[PDB]
């Protein structure tokens with residue numbers, strides 16, 4: 001069992017189906033960024049402590065879902081042998097319910113908050129911004145190729161989820177958020 | 188209060204003023220990278236311990252300043268209703284004074300150092316390299332559109348600040364820097 | 375000794391040799407991404423504990439090697455005064471021996487694993503994905519300019535190394551890997 005094949009040593013790689021692409025191809029960058037986000041979520045999850053245990057399982061669930069998203073990003077729309085498996089509806093409503101809940105419980109802001117606080121809150125804000133980076137790359141891809149737009153919907157909602165969860169993480173250890181001192185009332 | 192509007196679900200988003208852009212637009216990537224840096228700084232700050240307390244407040248101040256920078260990056264130069272608010276002079280001199288101080292106190296190198304050491308030092312080196320990534324994206328933007336060049340000046344100086352601060356973090360816990368074994372005398 | 379020269383304040387910077395480039399030039403992005411990876415490895419190394427001590431020295435060695443790689447990425451192929459110093463053969467075989475060893479010791483999977491587990495394992499998966507991001511940028515560069523292809527070979531192998539090491543980190547604290555629930559038998 002050798003995970004190193006050396007077939008990518010020249011800069012090309014396989015996607016789902018028969019096609020090979022350069023590794024800097026927008027498709028390969030898109031699910032590559034999703035994989036980096038997925039790894040960061042894993043890292044975020046490893047920071048869970050006794051105060052924040054309630055967040056542990058949904059972070060693991062998000063990791064499962066990112067694999068589902070990345071599958072589809074790796075799959076060309078005109079591939080006869082492989083289909084899109086990701087449906088946005090239920091995973092996205094599930095995120096929305098959490099955003100709603102977490103928004104309700106934490107103290108309300110007007111203004112932008114400093115992305116920080118506890119180590120977990122801060123990690124969740126990093127997740128937020130990696131998701132948004134990945135989102136940009138999915139959009140780059142979408143502008144050149146037919147994608148499963150359900151993936152975009154979910155990844156879009158996901159960075160709102162990370163924002164909500166990060167505030168909730170602060171709430172769980174009673175760490176106050178700090179406001180951006182020059183913020184207008186934006187929320 | 189719903190932070191999810193679903194208006195970005197198709198890949199376009201508002202900037203400051205009336206314009207909408209794709210999320211992979213260089214402008215949106217520029218202040219997006221600044222937001223990721225801002226989140227990383229928050230994460231860096233959450234690692235502060237009893238040895239490194241003296242670094243806590245200026246990291247928070249940097250977060251405030253990154254919001255100021257990102258405002259301007261989000262603002263088109265020809266927007267009649269919105270202006271640039273960021274002036275580089277005082278924030279940049281403030282960084283320079285810190286670079287000078289931290290450079291003076293820590294042991295002097297000739298050679299490149301391994302970016303690492305304590306967890307905070309290492310986090311500061313990550314901040315250094317995220318700032319430089321963000322800087323590249325600001326430059327990408329500048330090559331297509333008129334920006335506030337003060338933002339570039341500050342973000343440029345900021346990665347030197349992170350280099351200096353990271354060495355200082357090592358000094359604060361008396362963790363020696365390690366040299367790149369094949370370095371020429373570069374400093 | 376001032377690390378801030380202010381020469382980059384306008385968005386251009388020197389590479390090895392006489393040439394200046396914009397900071398968003400693919401060459402500058404390539405060794406820039408390598409520097410970010412290098413910093414992340416430093417951060418990964420700072421997480422080493424009593425269970426995972428055996429990983430400490432090779433992470434430091436990787437940092438040395440990334441400087442060697444970045445040197446060459448910074449060096450134009452037609453630069454009369456500066457040469458490529460990086461040879462892939464021995465560093466790459468060294469990675470392969472570790473991949474082989476670590477693959478042998480850890481429990482075998484069929485299926486994709488969730489990138490996560492212990493804090494070090496998870497950090498190693500982040501390293502994995504930053505290496506792959508950097509790899510894409512090296513490929514971007516290669517498609518425009520002559521590079522030392524040895525660097526590509528090594529950086530390619532390196533993300534397999536990080537995958538193997540991350541599983542090994544889990545093994546060292548007896549943290550089980552979790553499987554992607556919808557995985558096909560991919561390994």
Ligand SMILES: Nc1ncnc2c1ncn2[C@@H]1O[C@H](COP(=O)(O)OP(=O)(O)OP(=O)(O)O)[C@@H](O)[C@H]1O
Nearest residue numbers: 004005006007008009013014015023032506509510
């Ligand atoms: N640098 C990269 N960034 C993002 N995705 C990648 C990268 N390289 C490969 N991939 C994708 O992820 C899968 C696994 O990567 P892997 O390293 O096994 O591919 P490879 O580099 O082509 O092969 P090898 O490393 O064995 O030479 C690939 O089949 C490809 O779809």
Ligand SMILES: Nc1ncnc2c1ncn2[C@@H]1O[C@H](COP(=O)(O)OP(=O)(O)OP(=O)(O)O)[C@@H](O)[C@H]1O
Nearest residue numbers: 132135136191192193194195196200201202210219
């Ligand atoms: N992926 C992204 N990366 C960087 N910046 C973004 C991204 N998406 C939106 N932005 C910018 O940051 C602001 C907030 O993002 P937000 O998610 O609220 O926007 P949206 O995606 O357009 O809306 P929604 O998520 O409600 O559908 C936006 O108005 C836009 O300027």
Ligand SMILES: Nc1ncnc2c1ncn2[C@@H]1O[C@H](COP(=O)(O)OP(=O)(O)OP(=O)(O)O)[C@@H](O)[C@H]1O
Nearest residue numbers: 319322323378379380381382383387388389397406
């Ligand atoms: N944003 C960046 N991203 C990646 N690499 C960079 C960046 N800026 C400079 N470099 C490269 O790394 C070296 C060190 O960066 P440094 O900040 O010293 O350069 P500079 O910005 O041109 O100068 P200064 O900061 O003194 O105005 C440079 O000579 C250049 O090759």
Ligand SMILES: [K+]
Nearest residue numbers: 003004005534
């Ligand atoms: K491989």
Ligand SMILES: [K+]
Nearest residue numbers: 160190191192
């Ligand atoms: K939103």
Ligand SMILES: [K+]
Nearest residue numbers: 347377378379
């Ligand atoms: K400098």
Ligand SMILES: [Mg+2]
Nearest residue numbers: 156157159195
């Ligand atoms: Mg959004």
Ligand SMILES: [Mg+2]
Nearest residue numbers: 343344346382
């Ligand atoms: Mg600079």
Ligand SMILES: [Mg+2]
Nearest residue numbers: 008530531533
């Ligand atoms: Mg590979």
